[PDB]
């Protein structure tokens, strides 16, 4: 059993990083949504990832979309990706849904599940999860620039409301991953989402007993 | 004994030596910075 | 004796090579270990960056590239008793602890002094002090030894980065198990820090 | 000549001790133009 | 380890020539250094002029030849301190000081007992003990070494000369560094000497 | 062309001998020639003694030891016609007149800027002009030529000597035939002076 603890394997299969909603009834009448790739965006996720210093991998993302009774009609979906460092929309119709540079799916809901793979996009060698430094505050300690992969906006193709939410359930899988640096298991809680801070309430990493001496819980 | 005999020559040239001997006792334990400054240079004036 | 962080010596790059004026070694402020303390960790290279040559090529160069040799000296009687993990960890990002979410610029960068430990236990960064050992160490066990060297390499996601800008690794030397002695033995037990930069290279000169 | 570090002892030994410096020539070392000593 | 006074070792004349009854070790009476010593001085070979078969040797023969080897060993603890400066003086003429200008017999031959320094800065010769070090000599450390051995050929200006009327030279222990220790240790740490004259020659018996 | 001064290279001595950091050409602020100017002269190495990385070594070396390469350039039109004598003094001490017998710091070294004559006729130090050819020199005839190079080796009583206390060799720039022109021209004309130490050596690094 060696293939089971490999970092390939560790990082394999593809887990949920966002459940995107695509709001347009009663007064949310957006008809689009702007979701920034998170590979941390739950902490399941954020603590297996935080157990290496650097990675490099390609990303395939798979949509999940559904309306909110867990009908597919046949509503057609865009889902454009914004490369790092493109301008997002900023409404239902603006020009940015046409730019041929940001990549764009269509595809239904009554369709399986789009996928696609986005490759390794840092300008670094591999992505960073600890920059113990300044980009040049306080708040950008830590912050390095290099680890955005771009952003996921997706809209129904339609000219006015269609008065119905679509939910977007996004998995990933991360692929061809090569990790450095090992680092120790975050112990404490995360309290907040680019930075490691911990509450001042210290838990012991070990579970507690009555006595050095006594073999129960 | 060189610092005598340069007493008796009116210019010397060359290097020198200064051994430094410790007489603490044998559980004695500790670190000095013996520094050596240039004739140009003034004396510092931090460890540092 | 000498351990090597992840069993590369540091290398050149296949920019400014300094050959003796730089490669010399760096004692810094010694540290008294006392009953009560927590710990110390020194950014590199934060620590050099205003101290000597290396101080003046890493504020006069816009980018930098150096491995790093630290000696972790400790003058201690065979009546002192006490055991300190001296880790290298690299990219050591400093956590602030709040009821202040935020860490200071004198704790994410102490410069030459260094910064003490407030939570030791945490190496305040949220991550178990018992797990640091997947990080380059040693152990200095007061009735075994009283020296650490470890040789830590370039390790970067760039070829070249900023010495100003960005810390490569933090040297955090905590004691473990606390320094204890009888009435009459020094309260204090220093511990000297020697740093040795090596294939130091420098790059945009003004 | 610094402190580097503290004067560190066990118990039940002198704090204080002495250190005796030694000065000579090297090999290099040369005199020239006799002259009578101050003393 | 043993030194050789100017590089020599001492050897015959190329006249009474004793085996083993006269190389023997000859163990002098012990001295306790204190921390007030100033330091003690023997004349040889007036230290062994009524001492064993060298004493009545000395005493009963005209003329006398023989080289000397000297142990000055020190018996201390690791929590004793001090520096002993061992010299071996070619001619150690005494010199009186007046505010007397003239040395006692007890002072110029001190006998096997030995004579105790007055001004040891000047080595009771107006000579400074700080370039006493231009004669054959040892170090004690207490905390390096325990023992001195300086091994002297005969030096004189004549083949020969009488053992009772002329010393050769003079041995002097003097405490550089005073003895030092804490409460509880020995007041005082014994310094014993050992003389084995070497290739003695005697002439004139009766 | 280049003008080698009594007919030596500058070379090594068979210390710090720095490679590109200051073998680099150190061009100096231009002066305006006009019609009524006397000249100028800089005291070497006072001109580099706070000028980059040659000014930073030395300042903080006890003694030095360098060659030099001058360039004068001069940048005047083909209707502007003068003579500027351009001389290597080696040793030019500066001499005062009075009708005030020593002359100030600020004439001794003038530094990077440069002093102006106030006597070129005797070279403001007791000297004829006219004979200044036998130290080495090049003439800039506006109408044939409007460089000159000279190649100065280390010339010295004594093989190494402090940079900021003593002055090897003066540079002199003189206009010999005074410049003049015609309404419309330029009424001045740069002198550039372009210094390329060469061979630097350095001791004493605080």
Same mark, same amino acid.
């Given at each position: 059993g060696v293939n089971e603890a490999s970092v390939e394997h560790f990082y394999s299969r593809a887990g949920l990083v966002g459940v995107v909603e695509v709001k347009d009834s009663g007064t949310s009448q957006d008809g689009y949504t702007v979701w920034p790739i998170d590979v941390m965006g739950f902490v399941q996720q954020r603590r297996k990832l935080e157990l290496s210093t650097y990675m490099r991998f390609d990303a395939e993302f798979t949509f999940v979309s559904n309306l909110n009774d867990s009908t597919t009609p046949g509503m057609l979906l865009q889902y454009m990706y914004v490369p790092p460092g493109a301008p997002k929309p900023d409404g239902r119709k603006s020009y940015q849904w046409q730019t041929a540079t940001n990549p764009s799916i269509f595809a239904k809901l009554s369709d399986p599940p789009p996928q696609v793979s986005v490759p390794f996009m840092s300008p670094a060698s591999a992505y960073q999860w600890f920059y113990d430094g300044y980009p040049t505050t306080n708040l950008q300690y830590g912050q390095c620039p290099n680890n955005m992969m771009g952003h996921f906006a997706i809209r129904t193709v339609s000219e006015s409301t269609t008065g119905k939410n679509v939910h977007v359930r996004v998995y990933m899988r991360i692929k061809h991953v090569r990790a450095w640096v090992p680092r120790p298991f975050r112990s404490q809680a995360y309290m907040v989402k680019n930075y490691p801070t911990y509450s001042q309430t210290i838990s012991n990493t070990a579970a507690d007993r009555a006595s050095i001496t006594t073999t129960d819980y | 004994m060189v610092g005598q005999i340069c007493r008796y020559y009116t210019q010397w040239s060359g290097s020198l030596k200064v051994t430094f001997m410790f007489t603490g006792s044998f559980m004695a334990t500790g670190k000095m910075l013996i520094a050596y400054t240039p004739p140009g240079s003034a004396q510092p004036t931090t460890r540092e | 004796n000498i351990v090597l962080s992840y069993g590369e010596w540091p290398g050149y790059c296949p920019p400014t090579r300094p050959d003796v004026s730089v490669n010399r070694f760096y004692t810094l402020s010694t540290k008294s270990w006392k009953t009560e303390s927590t710990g110390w960790y020194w950014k590199f290279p934060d620590v050099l960056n205003d101290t000597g040559v290396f101080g003046q090529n890493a504020q006069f160069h816009y980018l930098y590239r150096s491995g790093f040799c630290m000696h972790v000296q400790c003058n201690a009687s065979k009546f002192h008793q006490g055991a300190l993990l001296v880790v290298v960890i690299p990219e050591?990002? @400093?956590?602030?602890? &709040?009821?202040?979410?935020?860490?200071? /610029?004198? !704790?994410?960068?102490?410069?030459?002094?260094?910064? @003490?430990?407030?939570?030791?236990?945490?190496?305040?960064?949220?991550?178990?002090? #018992?797990?640091?050992?997947? /990080?380059? !160490?040693?152990?200095? %066990?007061?009735?075994? %030894?009283?020296? =650490?060297?470890?040789?830590?390499?370039?390790?970067?996601?760039?070829?070249?980065? &900023?010495?100003? %800008? !960005? &810390?490569? /690794?933090?040297?955090?030397?905590?004691?473990? #198990?606390?320094?204890?002695?009888? %009435?009459? =033995?020094?309260?204090? @037990?220093?511990?000297?820090?020697?740093?040795?930069?090596?294939? &130091?290279?420098? #790059?945009?000169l003004r | 000549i610094w402190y580097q570090t503290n004067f560190v002892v066990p118990p039940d030994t002198p704090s204080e001790a002495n250190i005796i410096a030694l000065g000579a020539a090297q090999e290099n070392f040369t005199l020239k133009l006799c002259k009578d000593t101050d003393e």
């Open positions: - | - | 050591f990002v @400093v956590a602030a602890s &709040s009821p202040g979410l935020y860490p200071d /610029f004198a !704790h994410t960068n102490p410069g030459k002094e260094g910064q @003490v430990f407030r939570d030791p236990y945490v190496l305040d960064a949220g991550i178990p002090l #018992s797990q640091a050992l997947v /990080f380059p !160490h040693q152990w200095i %066990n007061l009735r075994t %030894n009283n020296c =650490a060297t470890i040789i830590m390499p370039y390790v970067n996601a760039l070829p070249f980065d &900023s010495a100003l %800008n !960005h &810390s490569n /690794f933090g040297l955090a030397v905590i004691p473990i #198990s606390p320094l204890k002695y009888c %009435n009459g =033995a020094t309260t204090e @037990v220093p511990i000297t820090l020697t740093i040795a930069p090596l294939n &130091s290279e420098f #790059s945009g | -």
